[PDB]
From a paper:
CASKIN2 and its mammalian homolog CASKIN1, are multidomain proteins that share the same overall organization. The amino terminal half of both proteins consist of protein-protein interaction modules, namely six ankyrin repeats, an SH3 domain, and two SAM domains. Sterile Alpha Motif (SAM) domains are well represented in the human genome reflecting the versatility of this compact, five-helix fold to facilitate protein-ligand interactions that include other proteins, nucleic acids and lipids. Using the CASKIN2 scaffolding protein as a focus of this investigation, we have demonstrated that its SAM domain tandem is able to sample monomeric, dimeric, and oligomeric states.
The structure was subsequently solved at 2.75 Å resolution from a SAD dataset acquired at the Canadian Light Source Synchrotron. A single SAM domain tandem was observed in the asymmetric unit. Despite having ~60 % sequence identity to CASKIN1 SAM tandem, we observed a different oligomeric architecture in the crystal structure of the CASKIN2 SAM tandem. In contrast, the CASKIN2 SAM tandem presented here forms a domain swapped dimer where SAM1 interacts with SAM2 of a second molecule and vice versa. The intra-SAM domain contacts within one dimer and inter-SAM domain contacts between dimers follow a head-to-tail type interaction that has been observed in many homo- and heterotypic SAM-SAM structures including, but not limited to AIDA-1, ANKS3/ANK6, Ste11/Ste50, LEAFY, Liprin-α/Liprin-β, Ph/Scm, Shank3, Ship2/EphA2, TEL, and Yan/Mae. While the SAM-SAM head-to-tail interaction is predominantly hydrophobic, ionic contacts serve an important role at the intramolecular SAM-SAM interface of the dimer and the intermolecular SAM-SAM interface between dimers. Specifically, ionic contacts were observed between D527/K610 and D516/K611 at the intramolecular SAM1-SAM2 interface and between H538/D585 and K540/D592 at the intermolecular SAM1-SAM2 interface. A hydrophobic network with contributions from W554 and Y558 and peripheral support from L555, together serve to restrain the linker in one conformation in the crystal structure. Near the linker, an ionic contact (E565/R618) from the SAM domains across the dimer interface further add to the compactness of the assembly. In the crystal structure, the C-terminal segment of helix 5 in SAM2 extends to G658 and makes contacts with a similar segment in another dimer.
Numbering used by the authors:
A (entry chain A), B (entry chain A): 21 to 160
């Protein structure tokens, strides 16, 4: 198991790791767990109040989000972080590409005065744009 | 370096790994490399014809795509693979959620006769739907 070893690690930091299989059988992984509620834990069989209280508390301390597991960037900076290019955010913003909907229409010739000059970052970004467009038209 | 060790590994499988820094300085990573052309390799300074011929050939043999690095799913199955839920594709298709644009309007009550019954897979999917909607309205 691959996310099992992520759960088992996190549950071990407070000696509740014998609940690992509870999250597995329910299909959960760590980022989804971070958004459960107490009733969700009850639903998957965490019924002992002493343990459900403690797992809830330990979940609020989980501060790793937000486009995991979905992998849908909602805003521009999230997306440049999916890609490995957050260093370009504020160049894109100074040039008026400050939203997903506007970035989708960015074009190969703007790139030089925005400041994306390494050709690999150039290509990676424009492939992201191209197929971001392909996803908008996907709604009809 | 993290994708450097991915390049250095792949270039080593044909003893050309001393080109690793060429791809780094240009910002490339493996999935972007897989889409380069010969002129792209020239541009980043792979100028010796014997090596550029061989790296090109070795790139066509790279068959790992397609939403990496972009992390924008273009079609429904890609997206259920971003998430860890491809086992549900054909249930979603038998129920008429066979595109991104239609999935974006899937709702919590359909889930039982589609066949998504593990609550963690339920939550993971509906978070993906919710924020997929949030991304469509993002285009105005």
């Amino acid at each position: 198991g691959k996310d099992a070893q992520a759960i088992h690690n996190w549950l071990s930091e407070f000696q509740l790791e014998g609940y690992t299989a509870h999250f597995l059988q329910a299909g959960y992984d760590v980022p989804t767990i971070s958004r459960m509620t107490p009733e969700d834990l009850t639903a998957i069989g965490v019924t002992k109040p002493g343990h459900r209280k403690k797992i809830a508390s330990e979940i609020a301390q989980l501060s790793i989000a937000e486009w995991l597991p979905s992998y849908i960037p909602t805003d521009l900076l999230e997306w440049l972080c999916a890609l490995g290019l957050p260093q370009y955010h504020k160049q894109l913003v100074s040039s008026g590409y400050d939203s997903m909907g506007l970035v989708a229409d960015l074009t190969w010739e703007e790139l030089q005065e925005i400041g994306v000059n390494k050709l690999g970052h150039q290509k990676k970004l424009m492939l992201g744009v191209k197929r971001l467009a392909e996803l908008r038209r996907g709604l009809l």
